[PDB]
Amino acid sequence: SGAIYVGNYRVVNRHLATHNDWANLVWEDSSRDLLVSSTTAQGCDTIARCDCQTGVYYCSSRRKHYPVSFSKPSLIFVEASEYYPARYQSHLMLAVGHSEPGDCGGILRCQHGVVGIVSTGGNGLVGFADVRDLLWLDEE
Ligand SMILES: CSc1ccccc1CC(=O)N1CCc2nc[nH]c(=O)c2C1
Ligand SMILES: [Zn+2]
């Protein structure tokens, strides 16, 4: 579990969104595993606006933050999980690292701010849903 809290937005994995998220929906995209809902309180996270390929992510199944090198956001085939069939997920970045299903939502960050959230795992890889192209998170 986990979310990004930027401005009056809450960014979560679409597959972990609650009824309150769907009832206060701003935007969702199944191909990216992302959903954004509106918040009453302002958040403290800042979004990175960059092409970094090194950063640090939080792994809840180890209570640890790990430094990683990660690929550029791409269209990647992901095997079937409890939430999606085997399919192509877009705007996904891969790194070598530990990730169990419940690790989804953990933040990946670089020197500029939040880069994305854990979305996929298995085979000793971790995948992150990028948010750096969502410029509108910084306004309204
Ligand atoms: C944090 S997500 C996670 C973590 C550990 C295990 C499973 C998940 C869900 C997930 O994304 N799967 C299902 C398992 C799987 N196995 C091999 N290759 C893959 O591409 C996948 C994709
Ligand atoms: Zn960066």
Residues preceding chain discontinuities in the chain with C to N over 2.5 Å: none
Q: Which residue intervals of 9-129 are DSSP H helices?
A: 19-23
Give Cβ neighbours of residue 23 (< 8 Å, ≥ 6 apart): none
Identify the experimental approach: X-ray
Q: How far is CA 133 from the centre of its chain?
A: 12
Output the CA torsion sign for 49, 102, 21, 14: positive
CB 4 within 8 A of CB 45: yes
Active site (annotated) includes residue 44: no
Report whether residue 110 contacts ligand 1, using a CB cutoff of 6 Å: no
* Pair 130, 73: CB distance under 8 Å: yes
Q: Say how far apart CA 95 and CA 38 lie, in whole Å.
A: 30
Distance CA 104, CA 108 (A): 11
- Which residue is listed with tokens 């933040």? 107
Distances in Å between the Cα of 34 and the Cα atoms of 9, 21, 119 are 12, 12, 9
Residue 33 appears among annotated catalytic residues: yes
To one decimal, the resolution in angstroms is: 1.2
Which among 21, 33, 103, 130 is annotated as catalytic?
A: 33
Q: How far is CA 33 from CA 67, 104, 112, 121, in A?
A: 23, 10, 23, 13
Which atom of ligand 1 is nearest the CA belonging to 77? 20
Contact yes or no for 131/114 (Cβ under 8 A): yes
Q: Give the Cα-Cα-Cα angle 92, 97, 99 (nearest 5 degrees).
A: 75
Q: Where are the domains of the chain?
A: 3-44, 45-140
Q: Which two tokens stand for residue 51?
A: 């092409």
Q: Which of 110, 31, 27 is nearest to 70 (CA)?
A: 110
Determine the Cα–Cα distance for residues 110 and 136; give it in Å rounded to an integer: 20
Out of 74, 76, 81, 84, mutate this one to test ligand 1's pocket (max ligand atoms within 8 Å of CB): namely: 81
What span, in angstroms and rounded, lies between the C-alpha atoms of 23 and 32?
20
Query: For residues 41, 113, 32 and 12, what is the CA-based torsion angle, rounded to 10 degrees?
Result: -30
